[PDB]
Amino acid sequence: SYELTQPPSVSVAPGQRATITCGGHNIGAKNVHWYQQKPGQAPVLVIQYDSDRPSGIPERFSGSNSGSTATLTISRVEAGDEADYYCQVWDSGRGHPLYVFGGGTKVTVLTQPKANPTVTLFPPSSEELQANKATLVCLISDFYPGAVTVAWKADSSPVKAGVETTTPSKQSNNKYAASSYLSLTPEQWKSHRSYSCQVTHEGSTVEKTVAPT
Amino acid sequence: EVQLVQSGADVKKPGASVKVSCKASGYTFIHFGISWVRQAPGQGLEWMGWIDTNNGNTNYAQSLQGRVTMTTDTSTGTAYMELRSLSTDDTAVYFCARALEMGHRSGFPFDYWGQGVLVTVSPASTKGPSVFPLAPSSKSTSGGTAALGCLVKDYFPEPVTVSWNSGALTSGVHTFPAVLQSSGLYSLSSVVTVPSSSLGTQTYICNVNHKPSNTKVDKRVEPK
């Protein structure tokens, strides 16, 4: 179906302007609506029909839509604007109409210094292997802002199946931690030369690799 | 004031069905359609379908056609969503949302939302964990620091508490939050960072406690 593309995250210092884009083929021909969602709450409509603020939404929220990109702008951002933001359009769906949401952008308001992630990757243990199972454990700690993307590769090719990744949660020292797990069979583990866990954070990546040897 | 208040949160087994409700108040119930939107834990919003509260006309997501049924009860101002043949992929918070009209040429935004109800699809009521050692990569002769730990695999429900050396070791201990896997079971890791020189001289044992299954596991972690 019609697809919407949002960046996973946006980091912004207090008072700066936050820009969240929503890409779609000729999305300028559609009405785009924007929803804000804080944790454990329901979404809130903050921009409707490309650029209209519903009643009660601060004037620092604004939106535009042109060509292949719609944009939600949060001017003079405040700490309380930290949330996930979702774009949305209606589509005719070849006589089967639908709504589609973008994947959502986590907007972090920078209230503490940037911290690069520590990545620890463990291969499957002999005990787990000797029990006909295999798990690669990728542990990600002491990073801020709390948004990462984890990609796995078998040798060189990406692997999506068997991957479970947590949502980053705050540590005791107020930084963030997360973990990603790759499940596979002992044979796929043995069949490849190596496996890699790649962690993307604030535009940079830390990649660790392990091998059956 | 417009309010949507949901009910019907529940815990289910794979293959079962579930029915949730959305009670509208503060406006003319039949003047506005109702959409349904779900959110799996940690994931984004996924539109499910819409219903005309006046005549019962629906538009469903193609991926759900045949499996979902939405209804309206105009005598109580309530919308209902039934989802059959549940899998662990259906574990999610389910939201209802007011959407004036939806059609083949236009669709309104969702201006008021219910609070969401959690539906947990799980294959077990209780299940103890499998504990495996995460042996340190560094060696006793290595220098600097070493990370070793324990993998606590495939348990249900949360939580698992982990200590080290019966609680005598707390510096450098990090027990990570659990992940909900597509199997419906939880997994977590706990890792302790220790001086590399201690690998040949100090014994390291993780004390895993899963109270829901009445299970304790003291697993010894040996360098490889």
Coordinates of C-alpha atoms in Angstrom, one line a residue:
Chain A
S1 CA 0.0 0.0 0.0
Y2 CA 0.9 3.7 0.0
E3 CA 4.0 4.1 2.2
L4 CA 5.1 7.0 4.5
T5 CA 8.7 7.4 5.5
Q6 CA 9.8 9.2 8.7
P7 CA 13.2 9.3 10.3
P8 CA 13.4 7.2 13.5
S9 CA 14.6 10.1 15.6
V10 CA 15.5 13.8 15.8
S11 CA 17.7 15.4 18.5
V12 CA 17.3 19.1 19.3
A13 CA 18.6 21.4 21.9
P14 CA 16.1 23.4 24.0
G15 CA 14.9 26.4 22.1
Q16 CA 16.0 25.2 18.7
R17 CA 13.7 24.3 15.9
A18 CA 12.8 20.6 15.5
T19 CA 12.1 19.3 11.9
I20 CA 10.3 16.0 11.3
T21 CA 9.7 15.0 7.7
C22 CA 7.2 12.6 6.2
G23 CA 8.0 11.3 2.8
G24 CA 5.6 9.9 0.3
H25 CA 5.2 9.8 -3.5
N26 CA 3.4 13.0 -4.4
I27 CA 2.3 13.3 -0.8
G28 CA 1.7 17.0 -1.6
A29 CA -1.6 15.8 -3.3
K30 CA -2.8 14.5 0.1
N31 CA -3.8 15.9 3.4
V32 CA -1.3 15.1 6.1
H33 CA -2.1 15.0 9.8
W34 CA 0.3 14.8 12.7
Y35 CA 0.0 13.1 16.1
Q36 CA 2.1 13.5 19.2
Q37 CA 2.4 10.5 21.6
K38 CA 4.2 10.6 25.0
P39 CA 4.9 7.3 26.8
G40 CA 2.0 5.4 28.3
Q41 CA -0.5 7.9 26.8
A42 CA -2.7 8.0 23.7
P43 CA -1.8 10.0 20.6
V44 CA -2.8 13.7 20.3
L45 CA -3.6 15.4 17.1
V46 CA -1.3 18.5 16.9
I47 CA -1.5 19.4 13.1
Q48 CA -4.4 18.6 10.8
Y49 CA -4.7 19.1 7.0
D50 CA -1.0 19.9 6.4
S51 CA -0.9 23.1 8.4
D52 CA -3.9 23.6 10.7
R53 CA -3.5 23.7 14.5
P54 CA -6.4 22.1 16.4
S55 CA -7.7 24.2 19.3
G56 CA -5.4 24.1 22.3
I57 CA -2.2 23.3 20.5
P58 CA 0.7 25.8 20.9
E59 CA 1.4 28.1 18.0
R60 CA 5.0 26.9 17.9
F61 CA 3.7 23.7 16.2
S62 CA 3.4 24.2 12.4
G63 CA 3.3 22.1 9.3
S64 CA 3.8 22.2 5.6
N65 CA 3.4 19.8 2.7
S66 CA 4.8 20.1 -0.8
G67 CA 5.8 17.6 -3.5
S68 CA 7.1 14.4 -1.9
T69 CA 7.7 15.7 1.7
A70 CA 5.4 16.9 4.5
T71 CA 7.1 18.6 7.4
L72 CA 6.1 19.1 11.1
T73 CA 8.1 22.0 12.6
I74 CA 8.2 22.5 16.4
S75 CA 9.7 26.0 17.0
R76 CA 11.4 27.0 20.2
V77 CA 11.2 23.4 21.4
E78 CA 10.7 22.8 25.1
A79 CA 11.4 19.7 27.2
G80 CA 7.7 18.8 27.3
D81 CA 7.7 18.4 23.6
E82 CA 9.8 15.3 23.8
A83 CA 7.6 12.6 22.4
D84 CA 7.0 10.3 19.3
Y85 CA 5.4 12.1 16.4
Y86 CA 3.4 10.2 13.7
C87 CA 2.3 11.5 10.3
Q88 CA -0.8 10.1 8.6
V89 CA -2.7 10.2 5.4
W90 CA -5.9 8.7 3.9
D91 CA -5.6 6.7 0.7
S92 CA -8.3 5.4 -1.7
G93 CA -6.7 1.9 -1.8
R94 CA -8.2 0.9 -5.1
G95 CA -11.7 0.9 -3.9
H96 CA -10.6 -0.3 -0.4
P97 CA -9.8 2.9 1.4
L98 CA -7.4 3.0 4.4
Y99 CA -5.3 5.1 6.7
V100 CA -1.6 4.8 6.9
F101 CA 0.7 6.0 9.6
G102 CA 4.4 6.8 9.2
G103 CA 6.7 4.8 11.4
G104 CA 7.1 7.7 13.9
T105 CA 10.0 10.0 14.9
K106 CA 11.3 10.1 18.5
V107 CA 12.0 13.8 19.2
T108 CA 14.6 14.1 22.0
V109 CA 15.2 17.5 23.7
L110 CA 18.8 17.5 24.7
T111 CA 18.9 17.9 28.5
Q112 CA 22.3 16.3 29.1
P113 CA 25.5 15.8 27.1
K114 CA 25.8 13.4 24.2
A115 CA 27.1 10.0 25.2
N116 CA 28.3 7.4 22.6
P117 CA 27.1 3.8 23.1
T118 CA 29.1 1.0 24.6
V119 CA 28.4 -2.2 22.6
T120 CA 29.0 -5.7 24.0
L121 CA 28.4 -8.7 21.7
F122 CA 28.3 -12.2 23.0
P123 CA 28.3 -15.3 20.7
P124 CA 26.1 -18.3 21.5
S125 CA 27.5 -20.2 24.4
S126 CA 28.7 -23.8 24.1
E127 CA 25.9 -24.9 26.6
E128 CA 23.2 -23.3 24.5
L129 CA 24.7 -24.7 21.3
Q130 CA 25.0 -28.2 22.9
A131 CA 21.2 -27.8 23.6
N132 CA 20.4 -27.2 19.9
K133 CA 19.9 -23.4 20.2
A134 CA 21.9 -20.3 19.5
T135 CA 21.5 -16.6 20.5
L136 CA 23.7 -13.7 19.7
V137 CA 23.4 -11.0 22.5
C138 CA 24.1 -7.4 21.6
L139 CA 24.1 -5.1 24.7
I140 CA 24.1 -1.3 24.3
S141 CA 24.7 0.9 27.3
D142 CA 25.6 4.4 28.5
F143 CA 24.3 6.3 25.4
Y144 CA 22.3 9.5 25.1
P145 CA 19.9 10.5 23.5
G146 CA 17.9 7.3 24.0
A147 CA 17.5 6.4 20.3
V148 CA 19.5 3.7 18.4
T149 CA 19.0 1.6 15.3
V150 CA 20.4 -2.0 15.4
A151 CA 21.2 -3.8 12.2
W152 CA 22.5 -7.4 12.0
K153 CA 24.5 -9.0 9.2
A154 CA 25.3 -12.7 8.5
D155 CA 28.8 -12.3 6.9
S156 CA 27.9 -9.3 4.7
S157 CA 24.2 -9.7 4.1
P158 CA 21.6 -8.1 6.4
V159 CA 19.5 -10.4 8.7
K160 CA 16.1 -9.2 9.9
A161 CA 14.6 -12.5 11.0
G162 CA 15.0 -13.6 14.6
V163 CA 15.9 -10.1 15.7
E164 CA 14.4 -8.7 18.9
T165 CA 15.4 -5.2 20.1
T166 CA 14.3 -3.4 23.2
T167 CA 13.1 0.1 23.5
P168 CA 15.9 2.2 25.2
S169 CA 15.2 2.8 28.8
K170 CA 17.0 5.0 31.3
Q171 CA 19.8 3.6 33.5
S172 CA 20.5 4.6 37.1
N173 CA 23.1 7.1 35.9
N174 CA 20.4 8.6 33.7
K175 CA 21.9 7.4 30.4
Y176 CA 20.1 4.8 28.3
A177 CA 20.5 1.1 27.8
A178 CA 19.1 -1.3 25.2
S179 CA 19.7 -4.8 24.0
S180 CA 19.2 -6.7 20.7
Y181 CA 19.1 -10.5 20.3
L182 CA 19.6 -12.6 17.1
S183 CA 18.0 -16.0 17.3
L184 CA 19.2 -18.7 14.8
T185 CA 19.9 -22.4 14.6
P186 CA 23.3 -23.9 15.4
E187 CA 23.7 -24.6 11.7
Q188 CA 23.2 -21.1 10.4
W189 CA 25.6 -20.0 13.2
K190 CA 28.1 -22.5 12.0
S191 CA 27.4 -21.9 8.3
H192 CA 28.7 -18.3 8.2
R193 CA 32.1 -16.8 8.6
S194 CA 31.0 -14.2 11.1
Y195 CA 28.0 -12.2 12.4
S196 CA 27.9 -8.5 13.2
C197 CA 25.8 -6.3 15.4
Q198 CA 25.7 -2.7 14.1
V199 CA 24.4 0.1 16.4
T200 CA 23.6 3.5 14.8
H201 CA 23.4 6.4 17.2
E202 CA 23.3 10.1 16.3
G203 CA 24.5 9.5 12.7
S204 CA 27.5 7.3 13.7
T205 CA 27.7 3.5 14.1
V206 CA 29.6 1.1 16.4
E207 CA 29.8 -2.4 15.0
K208 CA 31.0 -5.5 16.8
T209 CA 31.6 -8.9 15.2
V210 CA 31.8 -12.5 16.4
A211 CA 32.7 -15.7 14.7
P212 CA 32.1 -19.4 15.4
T213 CA 35.9 -19.9 15.8
Chain B
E1 CA -16.6 17.3 26.4
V2 CA -15.9 14.5 23.9
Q3 CA -14.6 11.4 25.7
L4 CA -13.8 7.9 24.4
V5 CA -13.5 5.4 27.3
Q6 CA -12.4 1.9 26.4
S7 CA -12.9 -1.4 28.0
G8 CA -12.1 -5.1 27.3
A9 CA -8.4 -5.4 28.1
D10 CA -7.6 -9.0 28.4
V11 CA -5.0 -11.9 28.3
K12 CA -5.5 -14.5 25.6
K13 CA -4.0 -17.7 24.2
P14 CA -3.0 -18.1 20.5
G15 CA -6.0 -19.0 18.4
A16 CA -8.5 -17.4 20.8
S17 CA -10.6 -14.3 20.0
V18 CA -11.0 -11.0 21.8
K19 CA -13.7 -8.2 21.8
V20 CA -13.0 -4.7 23.0
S21 CA -15.3 -1.8 23.4
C22 CA -15.3 2.0 23.0
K23 CA -17.9 4.0 24.8
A24 CA -18.5 7.5 23.4
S25 CA -19.9 10.4 25.3
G26 CA -20.3 14.2 24.9
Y27 CA -21.4 14.4 21.3
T28 CA -24.0 13.0 18.8
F29 CA -22.8 9.3 18.6
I30 CA -24.0 8.7 15.0
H31 CA -22.6 11.9 13.5
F32 CA -19.0 10.6 13.7
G33 CA -17.3 7.4 12.7
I34 CA -14.9 5.5 14.9
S35 CA -11.5 4.2 13.9
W36 CA -9.4 1.5 15.5
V37 CA -5.6 1.7 15.9
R38 CA -3.3 -0.8 17.6
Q39 CA 0.3 -0.4 18.8
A40 CA 2.5 -3.4 19.6
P41 CA 4.9 -2.8 22.5
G42 CA 7.7 -0.5 21.4
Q43 CA 6.3 -0.2 17.9
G44 CA 4.3 2.4 16.0
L45 CA 0.7 3.0 15.2
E46 CA -1.2 0.6 12.9
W47 CA -4.6 1.5 11.5
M48 CA -7.1 -1.4 11.7
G49 CA -10.4 -0.2 10.4
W50 CA -13.3 2.3 10.6
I51 CA -17.0 2.0 11.2
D52 CA -19.9 4.3 10.3
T53 CA -21.7 4.5 13.7
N54 CA -25.0 5.4 11.9
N55 CA -25.4 2.5 9.4
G56 CA -22.7 0.0 10.4
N57 CA -20.7 0.4 7.2
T58 CA -17.1 -0.5 7.7
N59 CA -13.7 -0.2 6.0
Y60 CA -11.1 -2.7 7.3
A61 CA -7.4 -3.0 6.7
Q62 CA -6.8 -5.6 4.0
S63 CA -4.4 -7.5 6.2
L64 CA -7.3 -8.0 8.7
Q65 CA -10.1 -8.8 6.3
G66 CA -11.9 -11.9 7.3
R67 CA -10.4 -11.9 10.8
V68 CA -11.8 -8.6 12.3
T69 CA -15.4 -7.4 12.9
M70 CA -16.4 -4.0 14.0
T71 CA -19.9 -3.2 15.3
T72 CA -21.9 -0.3 16.7
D73 CA -24.6 -0.3 19.4
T74 CA -26.5 3.0 18.9
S75 CA -28.6 2.3 22.0
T76 CA -25.5 2.5 24.2
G77 CA -23.2 4.8 22.1
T78 CA -20.6 2.0 22.0
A79 CA -18.3 0.7 19.3
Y80 CA -16.9 -2.8 19.5
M81 CA -13.8 -4.5 17.8
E82 CA -13.6 -8.2 17.6
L83 CA -10.3 -9.9 16.5
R84 CA -10.2 -13.7 16.0
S85 CA -7.4 -16.2 15.5
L86 CA -5.0 -14.3 17.7
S87 CA -1.2 -14.7 17.6
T88 CA 1.6 -13.2 19.7
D89 CA 1.8 -10.7 16.8
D90 CA -1.5 -9.3 18.1
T91 CA -0.2 -8.4 21.5
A92 CA -0.7 -4.7 21.5
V93 CA -2.5 -1.7 23.0
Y94 CA -5.8 -1.2 21.1
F95 CA -7.1 2.3 20.7
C96 CA -10.4 3.7 19.4
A97 CA -10.4 7.2 17.8
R98 CA -13.2 9.5 16.6
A99 CA -13.1 10.1 12.9
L100 CA -16.0 12.1 11.5
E101 CA -16.3 10.3 8.1
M102 CA -14.1 8.1 6.0
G103 CA -14.8 7.3 2.4
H104 CA -13.6 6.5 -1.1
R105 CA -12.6 10.1 -1.8
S106 CA -11.6 11.6 1.6
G107 CA -10.9 10.9 5.3
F108 CA -10.9 13.0 8.4
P109 CA -8.2 13.0 11.1
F110 CA -8.6 11.3 14.5
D111 CA -9.4 14.2 16.8
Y112 CA -10.3 12.4 20.0
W113 CA -8.8 9.1 21.2
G114 CA -9.7 6.4 23.8
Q115 CA -7.1 5.6 26.4
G116 CA -6.0 2.2 24.9
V117 CA -6.5 -1.3 26.4
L118 CA -3.7 -3.9 26.4
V119 CA -4.4 -7.3 24.9
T120 CA -1.7 -9.8 25.8
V121 CA -1.4 -12.9 23.7
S122 CA 0.8 -15.4 25.4
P123 CA 1.4 -19.1 24.8
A124 CA 1.9 -19.9 28.6
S125 CA 0.7 -18.8 32.0
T126 CA 4.0 -19.5 33.7
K127 CA 7.4 -20.7 32.3
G128 CA 10.7 -20.8 34.0
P129 CA 13.8 -19.5 32.3
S130 CA 16.8 -21.2 30.6
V131 CA 20.1 -19.7 31.9
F132 CA 23.2 -19.8 29.9
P133 CA 26.6 -18.3 30.7
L134 CA 28.0 -15.4 28.8
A135 CA 31.7 -16.3 29.1
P136 CA 34.2 -13.3 29.1
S137 CA 36.0 -12.6 25.9
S138 CA 39.2 -11.5 27.7
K139 CA 41.5 -14.0 29.4
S140 CA 43.1 -14.0 32.9
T141 CA 46.4 -13.0 31.3
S142 CA 44.5 -10.2 29.3
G143 CA 44.6 -6.9 31.0
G144 CA 42.2 -4.2 31.7
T145 CA 38.6 -5.2 32.1
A146 CA 36.3 -8.1 31.1
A147 CA 32.6 -8.3 30.6
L148 CA 30.9 -11.6 31.6
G149 CA 27.3 -12.4 32.3
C150 CA 24.3 -14.6 32.1
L151 CA 21.6 -15.0 29.5
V152 CA 18.1 -15.6 31.0
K153 CA 16.1 -17.0 28.2
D154 CA 12.5 -17.7 27.3
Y155 CA 10.6 -17.0 30.6
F156 CA 7.1 -15.8 31.3
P157 CA 5.8 -13.6 32.9
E158 CA 8.1 -10.8 34.0
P159 CA 10.0 -10.3 36.2
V160 CA 13.4 -12.0 36.7
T161 CA 15.7 -10.6 39.3
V162 CA 19.5 -11.2 39.0
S163 CA 22.2 -10.8 41.6
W164 CA 25.9 -11.9 41.5
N165 CA 27.9 -14.0 44.0
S166 CA 24.8 -14.0 46.3
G167 CA 24.8 -10.2 46.3
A168 CA 28.4 -9.8 47.5
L169 CA 29.3 -8.4 44.0
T170 CA 27.5 -5.2 43.0
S171 CA 30.1 -2.9 41.4
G172 CA 30.0 -3.1 37.6
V173 CA 26.7 -5.0 37.6
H174 CA 24.2 -4.2 34.8
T175 CA 21.0 -6.2 34.5
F176 CA 19.4 -5.1 31.2
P177 CA 15.7 -4.8 30.7
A178 CA 14.0 -7.8 29.2
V179 CA 12.9 -8.1 25.6
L180 CA 9.5 -9.5 24.5
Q181 CA 10.2 -11.8 21.7
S182 CA 7.8 -12.9 18.9
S183 CA 7.4 -16.2 20.8
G184 CA 5.6 -14.3 23.5
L185 CA 8.3 -15.1 26.1
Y186 CA 10.8 -12.7 27.7
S187 CA 14.6 -12.8 27.6
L188 CA 17.2 -10.6 29.4
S189 CA 20.9 -10.4 30.1
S190 CA 22.9 -9.4 33.2
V191 CA 26.6 -8.6 32.8
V192 CA 29.2 -7.7 35.3
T193 CA 32.4 -5.9 34.3
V194 CA 35.3 -7.1 36.4
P195 CA 39.1 -6.7 36.3
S196 CA 40.5 -9.1 33.7
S197 CA 43.1 -10.3 36.3
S198 CA 40.2 -11.7 38.5
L199 CA 39.1 -14.2 35.9
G200 CA 41.5 -16.9 37.1
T201 CA 41.1 -16.1 40.8
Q202 CA 37.5 -15.0 41.5
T203 CA 34.5 -17.2 41.1
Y204 CA 31.5 -15.5 39.3
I205 CA 28.0 -16.9 39.8
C206 CA 24.7 -15.3 38.7
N207 CA 21.8 -15.9 41.0
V208 CA 18.7 -15.9 38.7
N209 CA 15.3 -15.6 40.5
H210 CA 12.0 -16.2 38.6
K211 CA 9.4 -16.1 41.4
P212 CA 6.4 -16.8 39.1
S213 CA 7.7 -20.3 38.2
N214 CA 9.2 -20.8 41.7
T215 CA 12.6 -21.1 40.0
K216 CA 16.0 -20.1 41.2
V217 CA 19.2 -20.8 39.1
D218 CA 22.7 -20.2 40.3
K219 CA 24.8 -20.4 37.1
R220 CA 28.6 -20.5 37.2
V221 CA 30.3 -18.4 34.5
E222 CA 33.7 -19.8 33.5
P223 CA 36.2 -18.2 31.2
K224 CA 36.6 -20.0 27.9

